[PDB]
């Protein structure tokens, strides 16, 4: 099929019982007529045929085509977004602004990610994506307030308030985690949103919505490690944060038996302890020797070489060291 | 642990025509080299050599714990002879790190350094020995740059989806970033990301190593920055005074890599806090 | 504004690059399916007549799509309305539009009624030929032919006289087009009307000032000569044939020289014997090698279709005196064209005449420098063997065969191998063994793999003829000598001949001479040898004695199925499963 | 001295010892009724020159170059 | 009727590699290729004869003189080897000797009858070299001196080897 | 689930092309296989080494008739399986099908014509459009071309390679370190690797083509001595005798496309290697067509 055979067909979308077809509709309608409006209506209809699943639209349809799609949707139903609000709105124009701002947050999060550079038209798409990402960076706070205010509202193809809140609150927590790299206090809000998402997902278990369980689990683990408000890794982390090192030595001696912690983690904490003793705190010298000895036994049991730190610590050997 | 009659028989094998029009080279290639050596014996030979070097480097042997100060002059001597042995320098040998695109002009030298590191495993041991004295690792910056360029080239040219299919290169990348961190050519936040290298794919570890290169261009592994703090008798680098000592953009790209793979790097998120 | 299907969709779809124009043109069927039949039949065809800026990319596809329209136009009654835009399309200067358009128009004539085509098709030919452009007249003569089986005499006369006008035009390319359509039209017109109209036009276009029109008159000579077989023919095709025989136009002499056989069969033997044999005689000694090589293909058929009353007399009186000059010619292509067919005269000429005359010619062409001539000589020696017998063939031609058994070209050696079981089928074991058995064994170590597999089959046929009592004596030990060669392709040949001979040797014979050699190669360091061993055991599995099968063959296939190369693993597993 | 025109088939002293038996077989066969292909690269893809020294057949009825236009 | 004499330095210092990985002699030959590519663009430059001189000994110095076809010039340029000393003065003397060889027999140089701008044999010498110091068997000459041991007949009437219509250009390759 | 591959090989041997989905599945399987291959693919003797084929499918079947069927004879193909031929699709599909089916028994390297620009200009794209109507087959094949190895190494001695050497490359370890999964650039190591031509030269030289370099005997001598090679098998240029030794038998140019653009009248050749690395060249004339 094509854009013309689909334009005359009022039932072709009702027969194929797609995203490539949607981007074909947008590409033909990319240039500015009644054919344009018909193409937008068909694209919106077939997009709505998927129950508005941004988890399938985001991956295939690129950022500018999806931007055009939901901008056309907002032109269709609605009429800044932060100053307008009016969350007690008709269903369609509620979930439309909801989905648009969820998309806004999701693409900000996705744009922050690193993509694989293509080793081997592209310039126009790059410029357009850069421009829309720039204006999104300008107005990301408005979207955050809109989604946050909407999450506080539970007035209401109506969708369940539980799933409509869990998806958006997950997006809020992801956005805060994106900004958590800059302002560490932002992580607390991400923690609360993520715990709400975990509780809601465990409660209802909705499917349409569907969330990556592994991503949510890793998000919750990261928030637990970062903001405190257990496995030996987190035990070592809190012990280092609280200034207690004897339990670090004991859990390292136990780790020599279990072989649980990464060797890289042990070498890094040994280096951090050496750096802190280097900075001051003469009370750390025995702690540095103790964890160095623990790492050395871990290394010999794993069949790896003895470090330079151990060898220089055994210059001037002492009874207690031995 | 380093790496590495005629006419009578010919007449007998003859049939009234030669058939083959020649013999390429001297015939068949040999069955290649063979290696058989104990790993533990290698470990303890390395231990005896490294203990001797630490004895030679340290000052002659108060607090009943702690260690003597390794001489930065002795470790500087070890570093400069390591540089001379592995790559006789003066193509690019200034301590300043050049732009990343300059690595595409010295690629033969970087591959030579990479092969030397691969063949002779104790080059990493002597590298850590150099790193034990802080300012001495600056004088070995050519080796660090060359090995980093070789590893970046490998990760860019890796079609595998995980770093586990490149065991030596994974270990070399981990060891190289750990050695820079130990020598304080990186801040503790940037020097901790050898934990995650086993979890990532080649392109993000390539990005993180490029962030190492960018940070070293921005700050520079120079010995003049290592101020002599005489409270103990050894050199100190404090990146905070240099401005952006946390490595702002480099921390940003590392946190983006973490957030991409948050499903598996959740537990490691605590090793990269800027405060 | 833009919701209207035809203009708004099709023009804005055709405004894109070339491949999208081809796609959108191909989707013109769909725009007819979506709309009702009356709307398309009343609107769609005008815009096909309009916006003529489509470039050469889409015109053939558009013509084909108009051709496949058979129901979406309205039916057989309205299908005549595909005549105007397709005809206007036929006025395009490039060529492929014209033949593709007329092919489309001929197809939709199946739905056409007499009255329908009398009302539109014949006026279309009228206005088409009347056009001021040569393309219109070429399409006019192209579309001319399909009206005769449906029209009546009253407009048959109009068709005939308008065709007559089309013969005597002035611009050259319409003369070429009409000349081409004469031969296609000559097969359908009434013979009396053909005499009345076409023969004056065919004759005076055979003398046209343009060599192309003479060429196509030569083309239409057969289609105008396959009928009218009374004295008519004697005074019909004669002038043009005798003029074209030795014509100054080298191309006309070429294309006559490639068509004599069908003409000669169509007009009886004795008549050609009487009339065109000076032309045939002098054609073989022509100035250029082109026509000389063209005519030399037609010796066998011209002789075989001739009259037996004087066949040998006419052949030895006219063909051989010029065949002597042809054989000793300086052109390789002429001799190559000769050698492919002139050796088929051995049944026709007889046995004694063949030995007395044809054999020196065959030996002369066997020593020819050009290897294609040698290959063509070897091509059909079975007929010579049948009509001469093994005796004289082995007496005269055998040393030439020995010389070409080790020729530079591999194709010649391949040809020689094909007749070795044939000759050995009629020869004695002793003489064959001393003379050619070593020669047959010399081919299994040839460089080319075609030669190798060629004489593997030869060895199979020989063992099928002679028997194991001789294969053991001669073939097998020298094969086993070749089994130990360092060159792995020689071991391949050992495995292949083991495969082919085992089928025709004997179960005990295979199990006690073929099997241990195959058992040896299972330890070869080359994976090719090992998987070929697995495949060979699979092939010879149901041939040898079943007791030795699980006793000896099974353990190595249990070893081969754990070979490090996946290819040998797969082949050994398949052999294990099918052996059962 | 390269391109000194070795006379291996005319001089047995040019034969290497390792390449003696096979060369012996070759030049034994060559003497009976039954080096080359080392042309300079410049005159290696010359198709005009090659076709000039070949008989005629019967007549009919980004980057810069990639050879044969 | 122009003449384009190339005085390609073939001293062994031309074996220095640039960052391109090619020796200075390789870029020198490539610069000659680029020069004739650019020169052939002018359609009035069709009639033009190239010459080649190197730094070798006098029998071997000249590799394309007069009455040598362009194919021989190309073949000789491609096969040059940098194996000599930087005998730049001697090579310049033999380059000017090549150009001023035919001046007396055809009498373009009118001695005592006035200097005729309309009687000329145009030519330019392009010497592609490096900045390396001059070298002879004795040592480093450190200054360009032109030998006068074996004067061409009639060289006493001009007092300088270079003539009216001859100009010298240098491509001193300093590629690091 | 490999009988369909044998049926495709049999189907292609009759010059019948595969469908678009067949070509798609073939290209996915081939991409999966070729991703594992290094840039310098080590090849074990025996092996038959072939040069340019350039779309002449019937000449490729002639090559098979000369050297043997593909599972039975190990083959090495040094690039240029497309363009300048009437059956580029059929020959490249047959080579990819044999690579998929018999991955250890046939090696296919990358030539200079295995690039998007060269295929678009010189007519592999046009052939794909003629035989399929859409460029998706051409897109599939060109995306497959990035995965082909650049070079091959036979027993660590012979160094099969389509084009020639590069001034930027001195060791095989540089070639192994190349990121070959990309378009053939207009400069740099991979470009000169697929585009360079030996010559009776001194050092390097700018190529008459727009890419690569041209190198003399001393260059290839240094390359062979540095990398511990005896020979640099090569396939990029046209050869009249089928094969031609170059540079004091350090470089040999094998051409396997007889009557190259159906007009050159050139003879072809393939170089066989056997268990003792003894080379024999089989010259073959073009197959008899109409
Ligand atoms: Mn070519
Ligand atoms: Mn090529």
Swiss-Prot record, chain A:
Compartments where found? Nucleus; Chromosome
Q: What ranges cover the TPR repeats?
A: 166-204, 230-263
Q: Which top-rank group of organisms is this from?
A: Eukaryota
Q: Which family does this protein fall into? A: Belongs to the Integrator subunit 8 family.
Q: What does this protein do, in the record's words?
A: Component of the integrator complex, a multiprotein complex that terminates RNA polymerase II (Pol II) transcription in the promoter-proximal region of genes.
Q: What is known of its domains?
A: The WFEF motif is required for the recruitment of protein phosphatase 2A (PP2A) to transcription pause-release checkpoint.
Record's disease association: Neurodevelopmental disorder with cerebellar hypoplasia and spasticity: An autosomal recessive neurodevelopmental disorder characterized by global developmental delay, profound intellectual disability, seizures, absent speech, spasticity, facial and limb dysmorphism, and subtle structural brain abnormalities including cerebellar hypoplasia.
**How the protein assembles, per its UniProt entry?**
Component of the Integrator complex, composed of core subunits INTS1, INTS2, INTS3, INTS4, INTS5, INTS6, INTS7, INTS8, INTS9/RC74, INTS10, INTS11/CPSF3L, INTS12, INTS13, INTS14 and INTS15. The core complex associates with protein phosphatase 2A subunits PPP2CA and PPP2R1A, to form the Integrator-PP2A (INTAC) complex.
The protein's name is: Integrator complex subunit 8
Annotated gene? INTS8
UniProtKB/Swiss-Prot annotation, chain B:
Q: Which GO terms describe its cellular component?
A: cytoplasm; cytosol; INTAC complex; integrator complex; membrane; nuclear membrane; nucleoplasm; nucleus
Major subcellular location class: nucleus
The UniProt entry's sequence similarity note says: Belongs to the Integrator subunit 5 family.
Superkingdom of origin organism: Eukaryota
Q: What is the lineage of its organism?
A: Eukaryota, Metazoa, Chordata, Craniata, Vertebrata
- Any one Gene Ontology BP term: regulation of transcription elongation by RNA polymerase II
Keywords linked to the UniProt accession: Acetylation, Cytoplasm, Membrane, Nucleus, Phosphoprotein, Transmembrane, Transmembrane helix
Kindly indicate whether the keyword Transmembrane belongs to this entry: yes
The record's subunit annotation is:
Component of the Integrator complex, composed of core subunits INTS1, INTS2, INTS3, INTS4, INTS5, INTS6, INTS7, INTS8, INTS9/RC74, INTS10, INTS11/CPSF3L, INTS12, INTS13, INTS14 and INTS15. The core complex associates with protein phosphatase 2A subunits PPP2CA and PPP2R1A, to form the Integrator-PP2A (INTAC) complex.
Function field: Component of the integrator complex, a multiprotein complex that terminates RNA polymerase II (Pol II) transcription in the promoter-proximal region of genes.
Task: Provide the transmembrane region boundaries.
Answer: 122-142, 196-216
Cellular localization per UniProt: Nucleus; Cytoplasm; Nucleus membrane
Identify this protein by name: Integrator complex subunit 5
Give the stretch of the parent protein shown, with its full length.
Answer: 706 to 1009 of 1019
UniProtKB/Swiss-Prot annotation, chain C:
Give the main localization category: cytoplasm
Which cell locations does it reside in? Cytoplasm; Nucleus; Chromosome; Chromosome, Centromere
Q: Where are the HEAT repeats?
A: 1-39, 40-77, 78-116, 117-154, 155-193, 194-232, 233-271, 272-314, 315-353, 354-392, 393-431, 432-470, 471-509, 510-548, 549-580
Instruction: Kindly list the positions at which N6-acetyllysine occurs in this protein.
Output: 273
The record, for InterPro entries, names:
ARM-like, ARM-type_fold, HEAT, HEAT_type_2, PP2A/SF3B1-like_HEAT, PP2A_Regulatory_Subunit_A
Q: Name one Pfam family in it.
A: PPP2R1A-like_HEAT
| Entry function | The PR65 subunit of protein phosphatase 2A serves as a scaffolding molecule to coordinate the assembly of the catalytic subunit and a variable regulatory B subunit. Upon interaction with GNA12 promotes dephosphorylation of microtubule associated protein TAU/MAPT. Required for proper chromosome segregation and for centromeric localization of SGO1 in mitosis. Together with RACK1 adapter, mediates dephosphorylation of AKT1 at 'Ser-473', preventing AKT1 activation and AKT-mTOR signaling pathway. Dephosphorylation of AKT1 is essential for regulatory T-cells (Treg) homeostasis and stability.
Domain remarks: Each HEAT repeat appears to consist of two alpha helices joined by a hydrophilic region, the intrarepeat loop. The repeat units may be arranged laterally to form a rod-like structure.
PANTHER family, sorted:
SERINE/THREONINE-PROTEIN PHOSPHATASE PP2A 65 KDA REGULATORY SUBUNIT, SERINE_THREONINE-PROTEIN PHOSPHATASE 2A 65 KDA REGULATORY SUBUNIT A ALPHA ISOFORM
UniProtKB/Swiss-Prot annotation, chain D:
Q: Which domain of life is it from?
A: Eukaryota
Q: Where is this motif: Inhibitory loop?
A: 63-69
* Induction conditions: Frequently down-regulated in nonsmall cell lung carcinomas and prostate cancers. Down-regulation in prostate cancer is due to CpG hypermethylation of its promoter. However, some involvement in cancer is unclear.
Q: Where in the cell is it found?
A: Nucleus; Chromosome
> Which tissues express it?
Widely expressed. Expressed in heart, brain, placenta, lung, liver, skeletal muscle, kidney and pancreas.
What family is this?
Belongs to the Integrator subunit 6 family.
What does the UniProt function comment say about this protein? Component of the integrator complex, a multiprotein complex that terminates RNA polymerase II (Pol II) transcription in the promoter-proximal region of genes.
Q: How does it assemble?
A: Component of the Integrator complex, composed of core subunits INTS1, INTS2, INTS3, INTS4, INTS5, INTS6, INTS7, INTS8, INTS9/RC74, INTS10, INTS11/CPSF3L, INTS12, INTS13, INTS14 and INTS15. The core complex associates with protein phosphatase 2A subunits PPP2CA and PPP2R1A, to form the Integrator-PP2A (INTAC) complex.
Comment on protein domains: The inhibitory loop acts as a regulator of protein phosphatase 2A (PP2A) activity: Asp-66 and Glu-67 residues mimic phosphoserine and phosphothreonine residues and bind to the PP2A catalytic subunit PPP2CA active site to block substrate-binding.
Protein name in the entry = Integrator complex subunit 6
């Amino acid at each position: 099929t094509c854009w013309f055979e689909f334009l005359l067909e009022e039932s072709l979308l009702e027969k194929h019982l797609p995203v490539q077809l949607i981007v074909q509709f947008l590409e033909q309608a990319s240039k500015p007529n009644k054919r344009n409006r018909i193409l937008k209506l068909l694209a919106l209809k077939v997009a709505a045929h998927l129950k508005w699943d941004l988890d399938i639209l985001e991956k295939s349809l690129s950022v500018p085509v999806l931007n055009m799609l939901l901008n056309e949707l907002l032109c269709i139903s609605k009429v800044k977004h932060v100053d307008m609000d009016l969350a007690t709105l008709p269903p369609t124009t509620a979930m439309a602004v909801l989905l648009y701002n969820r998309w806004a947050i999701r693409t900000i999060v996705q744009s922050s990610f690193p993509v694989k550079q293509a080793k081997p038209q592209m310039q126009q798409e790059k410029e357009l994506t850069e421009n829309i990402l720039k204006v999104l960076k300008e107005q990301a706070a408005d979207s955050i307030l809109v989604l946050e205010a909407a999450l506080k509202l539970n007035k209401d193809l109506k969708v369940k308030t539980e799933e409509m809140q869990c998806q958006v609150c997950y997006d809020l927590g992801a956005a805060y985690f994106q900004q958590g790299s800059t302002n560490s206090a932002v992580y607390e809000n991400a923690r609360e949103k993520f715990f709400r998402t975990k509780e809601l997902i465990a409660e209802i278990g909705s499917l349409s919505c569907t969330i990556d369980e592994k991503r949510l689990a890793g998000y919750c683990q990261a928030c637990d490690v970062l903001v405190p408000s257990l496995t030996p890794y987190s035990q070592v982390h809190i012990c280092l944060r609280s200034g207690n090192y004897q339990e670090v030595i004991q859990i390292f001696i136990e780790d020599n038996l279990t072989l649980s912690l990464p060797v890289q983690f042990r070498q890094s904490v040994l280096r951090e302890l050496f750096k802190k003793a280097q900075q001051g705190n003469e009370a750390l010298d025995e702690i540095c020797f103790k964890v160095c000895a623990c790492n050395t036994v871990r290394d010999i049991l794993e069949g790896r070489t003895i470090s330079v730190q151990f060898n220089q610590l055994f210059l001037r050997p002492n009874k207690e060291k031995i | 642990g380093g790496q590495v009659a005629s006419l009578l028989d010919t007449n007998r094998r003859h049939i009234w025509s030669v058939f083959h029009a020649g013999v390429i080279g001297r015939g068949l290639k040999p069955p290649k080299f063979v290696q058989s050596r104990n790993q533990q014996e290698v470990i303890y030979n390395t231990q005896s050599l490294l203990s001797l070097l630490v004895h030679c480097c340290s000052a002659p042997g108060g607090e009943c714990w702690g260690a003597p100060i390794l001489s930065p002059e002795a470790a500087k001597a070890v570093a400069v002879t390591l540089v001379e042995s592995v790559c006789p320098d003066a193509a690019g040998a200034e301590l300043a790190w050049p732009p990343e695109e300059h690595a595409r002009a010295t690629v033969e030298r970087d591959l030579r350094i990479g092969r030397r590191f691969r063949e002779q495993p104790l080059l990493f041991e002597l590298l850590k020995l150099v790193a034990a004295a802080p300012p001495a690792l600056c004088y070995c910056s050519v080796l660090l740059r060359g090995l980093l360029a070789a590893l970046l080239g490998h990760w860019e040219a890796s079609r595998h989806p995980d770093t586990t299919h490149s065991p030596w290169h994974l270990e070399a990348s981990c060891t190289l970033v750990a050695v820079m961190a130990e020598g304080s050519l990186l801040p503790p936040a940037l020097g901790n990301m050898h934990e995650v290298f086993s979890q990532l794919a080649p392109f993000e570890v390539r990005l993180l190593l490029l962030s190492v290169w960018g940070f070293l261009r921005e700050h520079g592994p120079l010995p003049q920055k290592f101020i002599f703090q005489s409270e103990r008798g050894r050199f100190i680098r404090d990146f905070s005074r240099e401005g952006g000592g946390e490595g702002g953009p480099h921390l940003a790209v590392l946190h983006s890599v973490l957030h991409r793979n948050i499903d598996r790097l959740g537990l490691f998120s605590g090793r990269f806090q800027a405060p | 504004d833009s919701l209207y299907p035809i203009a708004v969709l099709i023009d804005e779809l055709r405004n894109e690059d070339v491949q999208l124009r081809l796609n959108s043109i191909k989707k013109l069927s769909t725009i007819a399916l979506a709309l009702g039949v009356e709307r398309t039949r009343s609107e769609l065809l005008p815009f096909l007549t309009d916006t003529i800026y489509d470039e050469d990319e889409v015109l053939l596809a558009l013509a084909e799509q108009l051709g496949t329209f058979t129901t979406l136009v309205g039916g057989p009654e309205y299908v005549h309305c595909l005549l105007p835009p397709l005809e206007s399309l036929a006025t395009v200067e490039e060529t492929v539009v014209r033949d593709k358009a007329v092919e489309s128009l001929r197809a939709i004539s199946h739905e056409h009624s007499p009255s329908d085509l009398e009302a539109h098709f014949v006026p279309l030919v009228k206005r088409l030929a009347g056009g001021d452009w040569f393309t219109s007249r070429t399409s006019a003569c192209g579309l001319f032919s399909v009206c005769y089986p449906r029209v009546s005499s009253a407009v048959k006369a109009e068709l005939r006289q308008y065709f007559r006008n089309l013969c005597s035009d002035d611009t050259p390319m319409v003369r070429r087009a009409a000349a081409s359509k004469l031969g296609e039209f000559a097969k359908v017109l009434e013979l009396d009307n053909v005499k009345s109209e076409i023969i004056p036009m065919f004759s005076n276009l055979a003398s046209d000032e343009q060599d192309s029109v003479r060429l196509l008159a030569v083309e239409a000579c057969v289609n105008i000569a396959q009928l009218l077989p009374q004295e008519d023919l004697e005074a019909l095709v004669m002038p043009t044939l005798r003029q074209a025989a030795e014509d100054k136009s080298w191309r006309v002499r070429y294309m006559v020289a490639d068509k004599f056989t069908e003409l000669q069969k169509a007009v009886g033997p004795e008549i050609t014997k009487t009339d065109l044999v000076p032309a045939f005689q002098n054609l073989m000694k022509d100035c250029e090698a082109e026509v000389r090589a063209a005519a030399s293909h037609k010796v066998k058929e011209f002789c075989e279709n001739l009259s037996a009353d004087c066949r040998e007399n006419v052949i030895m009186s006219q063909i051989l005196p010029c065949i002597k000059e042809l054989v000793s010619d300086a052109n390789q292509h002429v001799k190559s064209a000769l050698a492919s067919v002139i050796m088929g005269l051995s049944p026709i000429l007889g046995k004694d005449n063949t030995i007395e005359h044809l054999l020196p010619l065959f030996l002369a062409q066997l020593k020819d420098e050009c290897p294609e001539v040698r290959l063509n000589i070897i091509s059909n020696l079975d007929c010579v063997n049948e009509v001469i017998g093994i005796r004289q063939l082995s007496q005269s031609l055998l040393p030439a065969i020995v010389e070409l058994a080790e020729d530079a070209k591999w194709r010649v050696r391949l040809a020689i191998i094909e007749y070795m079981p044939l000759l050995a089928g009629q020869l004695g074991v002793e003489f064959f063994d001393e003379k050619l058995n070593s020669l047959c064994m010399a081919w299994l170590v040839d460089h080319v793999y075609a030669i190798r597999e060629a004489a593997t089959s030869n060895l199979k046929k020989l063992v099928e003829k002679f028997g194991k009592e001789w294969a053991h004596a001669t073939i097998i030990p020298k094969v086993l000598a070749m089994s130990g060669d360092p060159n792995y392709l020689h071991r391949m040949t050992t495995l292949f001949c083991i495969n082919v001979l085992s089928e025709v040797c004997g179960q005990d014979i295979t199990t006690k001479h073929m099997l241990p050699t195959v058992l040896r190669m299972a330890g070869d360091p080359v994976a090719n040898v090992r998987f070929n061993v697995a495949k060979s055991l699979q092939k010879i599995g149901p041939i040898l004695d079943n007791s030795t099968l699980q006793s000896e063959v099974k353990p190595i296939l249990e070893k081969l199925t754990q070979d490090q190369d996946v290819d040998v693993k797969y082949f050994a597993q398949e052999a294990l499963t099918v052996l059962s | 001295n390269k391109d000194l025109k070795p006379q291996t088939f005319r001089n047995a002293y040019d034969i290497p010892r390792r390449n003696l038996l096979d060369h012996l077989t070759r030049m034994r066969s060559n003497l009976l009724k039954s080096q080359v292909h080392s042309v300079p690269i410049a005159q290696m893809g010359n198709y005009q020159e090659y076709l000039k020294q070949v008989p005629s057949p019967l007549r009919e009825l980004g980057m810069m170059i990639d050879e044969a236009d | 009727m122009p003449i384009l004499l190339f005085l390609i330095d073939t001293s062994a210092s031309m074996n220095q590699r640039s960052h391109l990985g090619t020796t200075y002699l390789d870029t020198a030959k490539g610069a000659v290729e680029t020069f004739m590519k650019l020169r052939a663009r002018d359609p009035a430059s069709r009639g033009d004869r190239y010459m080649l001189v190197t730094f070798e000994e006098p029998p071997y110095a000249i590799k394309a003189g007069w009455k040598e076809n362009h194919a021989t010039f190309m073949n000789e340029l491609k096969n040059l080897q940098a194996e000599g000393l930087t005998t730049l003065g001697q090579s310049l003397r033999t380059a000017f000797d090549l150009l001023n060889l035919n001046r007396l027999v055809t009498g373009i140089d009118n001695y005592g009858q006035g200097r005729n701008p309309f009687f000329l044999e145009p030519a330019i010498i392009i010497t592609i070299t490096d900045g390396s110091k001059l070298t002879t068997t004795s040592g480093v000459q450190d200054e360009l001196h032109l030998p006068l041991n074996s004067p061409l007949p009639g060289s006493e009437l001009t007092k300088e080897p270079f003539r009216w219509d001859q100009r010298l250009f240098a491509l001193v390759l300093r590629l690091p | 689930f490999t009988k369909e591959l044998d049926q495709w090989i049999e189907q292609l041997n009759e010059c019948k092309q595969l469908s678009e989905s067949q070509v798609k599945s073939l290209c996915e399987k081939a991409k999966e296989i070729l991703t594992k291959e290094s840039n310098v693919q080590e090849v074990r003797c025996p092996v038959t080494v072939c040069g340019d084929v350039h779309g002449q499918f019937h000449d490729l079947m002639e090559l098979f008739r000369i050297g043997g069927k593909s599972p039975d004879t190990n083959y090495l193909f040094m690039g240029d399986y497309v363009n300048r031929g009437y059956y580029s699709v059929e020959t490249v599909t047959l080579l990819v099908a044999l690579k998929v089916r018999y991955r250890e028994r046939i090696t296919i390297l990358r030539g200079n014509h295995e690039s998007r620009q060269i295929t678009q200009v010189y007519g592999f794209y046009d052939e794909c459009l003629r035989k399929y109507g859409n460029a998706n087959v051409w897109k599939y094949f060109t995306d497959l071309f990035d995965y082909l190895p650049l070079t091959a190494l036979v027993d660590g001695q012979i160094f099969c390679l389509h084009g020639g050497l590069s001034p930027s490359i001195d060791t095989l370890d540089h070639i192994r370190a190349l990121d070959r999964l990309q378009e053939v650039p207009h400069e740099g190591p991979m470009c000169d690797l697929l585009w360079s031509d030996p010559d009776d030269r001194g050092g390097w030289g700018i190529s008459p083509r727009g890419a690569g370099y041209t190198f003399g005997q001393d260059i290839s001598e240094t390359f062979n001595h540095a990398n511990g090679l005896t020979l640099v098998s090569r396939a990029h240029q046209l050869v009249m005798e089928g094969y031609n030794w170059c540079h004091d038998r350090n470089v040999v140019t094998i051409f396997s496309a007889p009557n190259y653009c159906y007009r050159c009248g050139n003879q072809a050749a393939i170089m066989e290697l056997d268990d003792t690395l003894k080379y024999s060249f089989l010259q073959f004339d073009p197959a008899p067509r109409r």
